[PDB]
Amino acid sequence: KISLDQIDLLSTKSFPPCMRQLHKALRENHHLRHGGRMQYGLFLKGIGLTLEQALQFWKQFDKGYSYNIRHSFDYTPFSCLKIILSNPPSQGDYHGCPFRHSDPELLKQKLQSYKISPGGISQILDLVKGTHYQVACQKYFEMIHNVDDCGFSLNHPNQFFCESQRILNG
Amino acid sequence: SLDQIDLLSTKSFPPCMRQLHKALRENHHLRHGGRMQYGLFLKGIGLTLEQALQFWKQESYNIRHSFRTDYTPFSCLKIILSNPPSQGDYHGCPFRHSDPELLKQKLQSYKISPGGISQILDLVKGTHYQVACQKYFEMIHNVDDCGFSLNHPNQFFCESQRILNG
Ligand code: SF4
Ligand code: SF4
């Protein structure tokens, strides 16, 4: 067992926006609805981690849940197209793809909170207007890693993670 | 404690780290080059290799979840191009540093098919060490194309974990 706050830095450095938002929502709300638990949990599964949900003894608003991580040593982790094209999030949901599912003004605010430069935000929003969600995410990747070219064709959040970790490990 | 990742090593470690895990299990020790290569690889997956000491004794390897020094894991080119292993050293890259006959025997013990071993040895003879390792990856995971360009052992591990948990 491992605390869920241990991967805060990893989430900011290597998670794609779809999983970064879900980690943040889990940390702040102490719970995710089923759509988020599936998207984020299966993403963690693809890295070799087991998300675990627990109910606290004092639960008879705070729903009384506690989430943690455990290192793993038959649900398939979601691809980009599955996240973008299926299961659009309702108002209680934090899952989905921010480039496809966030209102553009809210998306701009979100990218600003991520410290993306104004030019990068402009390029990303341009790509979003063309419905090129994964290309916009490749742009996000390039901005957050300070590289000119991501060097791969993005089609999976876990692929995003592996390529980010490759860059970070030299 | 280290025996827990034997299976993990057979399924997800690249040959360079699989050989170091085997050597640690069998010799109960690694020299500094091997400890660095393997330990930094393990740190990158979230594990801390350490030796146990009794605190009450006045002046055995295990692993623990990681939870002061540069922990950056070695890349393929750093392993391949520097620190060639001496006898007694188990570090390095098997595609670059193992005699081809020993590499073929090792791949046989890894249950690679004869045709796959032939492909790998052809690539090694051309000095395409990372491409040979990509081919190894494709064989042990039964996939047509690995779908990535390999230049880091921890990247090998990450893509393997994607497939095994896919
Ligand atoms: S493009 Fe793919 S990886 Fe990027 S945020 Fe959208 S679903 Fe996630
Ligand atoms: S090519 Fe890289 S990952 Fe593969 S065995 Fe050699 S050093 Fe390890």
Numbering used by the authors:
A (entry chain A): 270 to 329, 341 to 353, 361 to 457
B (entry chain B): 272 to 330, 346 to 353, 359 to 457
According to the publication:
In eukaryotes, primers are generated by the heterotetrameric DNA polymerase α-primase (pol-prim) complex, which possesses two enzymatic activities in two distinct active sites. Primase, a DNA-dependent RNA polymerase, generates the initial hybrid RNA-DNA primed substrate, which is then handed off to DNA polymerase α (pol α) to extend the initial primer by approximately twenty DNA nts. Human DNA primase is composed of catalytic (p48) and regulatory (p58) subunits. The regulatory subunit has a C-terminal domain (p58C) that is unique to higher eukaryotes and contains a [4Fe4S] cluster.
To test if the differences between the p58C266-456 and p58C272-464 structures were a by-product of the differences in sequence, we produced, purified, and crystallized a p58C construct containing residues 266–464 in the conditions used to crystallize p58C272-464. With these residues omitted, density for residues in extended conformation that together formed a beta-type interaction were clearly evident in the p58C266-464 2Fo-Fc map. In p58C266-464, residues 330–340 and 353–360 in chain A and 330–345 and 353–359 in chain B are missing due to disorder. A best-fit superposition of the two structures reveals they are very similar, with a backbone RMSD of only 0.23 Å. Analysis of the p58C266-464 and p58C272-464 crystal structures reveals that substantial crystal lattice packing interactions stabilize this region in both structures. Specifically, Leu318-Gln329 are seen to interact extensively with the same region in the adjacent molecule in the lattice. In addition, on both sides of this extended interaction, Phe326 completes a hydrophobic pocket in the adjacent molecule, providing an additional anchor between the two molecules.
